[PDB]
Amino acid sequence: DQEWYDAEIPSEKTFKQRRTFEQRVEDVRLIREQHPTKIPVIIERYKGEKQLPVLDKTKFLVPDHVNMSELIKIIRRRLQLNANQAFFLLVNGHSMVSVSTPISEVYESEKDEDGFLYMVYASQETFGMKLSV
């Protein structure tokens, strides 16, 4: 392998690969006690997205009064994009929520069995390409 390894890029080992289900169940309980007004959201790059950057931080405490629009703004900031680059957030593997939906409602309806809320980001072009194969 003579390809250059960009050591700036974080490993995309996923959160569910780093800790067991039983660990995550307790992790949720602890983090919710520590931050009772925050929704604990795991945000990762969609496995098929290769143009948008990888974020160094994937574990987000999101204020429970904001809507998805506000969360999108936060992620776009961390990613450092233009109004020409954009993404969708795919929640819990299969929901694409209107940006007006309160995050508290997304948590109640879409939380994982382990108690965390999981999202992946990709451009609509990536998602469209993947759906079109």
Side-chain angles (χ1 to χ4, degrees):
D1 183 359
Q2 285 279 301
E3 278 278 298
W4 282 98
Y5 168 71
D6 192 348
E8 171 225 290
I9 304 176
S11 160
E12 267 172 316
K13 193 165 212 213
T14 72
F15 186 72
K16 288 199 178 184
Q17 293 173 312
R18 289 180 174 280
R19 285 175 79 74
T20 67
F21 177 79
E22 286 85 1
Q23 285 180 310
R24 286 181 263 113
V25 170
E26 175 61 358
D27 291 341
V28 167
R29 198 194 62 77
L30 290 169
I31 204 66
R32 286 283 277 163
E33 261 182 1
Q34 294 290 139
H35 304 273
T37 70
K38 303 298 172 55
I39 307 302
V41 190
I42 307 298
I43 305 178
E44 295 167 307
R45 188 171 75 161
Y46 173 60
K47 70 182 179 180
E49 174 60 53
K50 307 293 178 193
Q51 295 177 311
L52 297 173
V54 173
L55 284 181
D56 286 292
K57 315 153 132 33
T58 59
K59 299 161 53 177
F60 285 68
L61 299 167
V62 179
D64 66 6
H65 68 275
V66 309
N67 63 24
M68 285 293 288
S69 92
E70 186 47 58
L71 177 55
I72 294 159
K73 290 185 173 151
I74 292 153
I75 297 161
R76 180 187 283 273
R77 223 173 283 143
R78 298 284 332 169
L79 287 168
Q80 285 306 312
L81 316 175
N82 183 266
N84 94 318
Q85 279 187 318
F87 56 88
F88 287 150
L89 286 170
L90 177 71
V91 182
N92 191 29
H94 61 253
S95 314
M96 271 206 38
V97 191
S98 78
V99 304
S100 174
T101 312
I103 198 70
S104 59
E105 295 192 5
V106 181
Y107 190 47
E108 182 63 28
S109 64
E110 302 300 331
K111 74 172 61 173
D112 195 88
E113 183 64 29
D114 72 9
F116 283 117
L117 183 58
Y118 290 82
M119 310 189 180
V120 298
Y121 60 89
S123 66
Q124 81 186 337
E125 292 73 32
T126 294
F127 279 143
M129 187 279 295
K130 291 299 194 172
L131 292 173
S132 267
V133 309

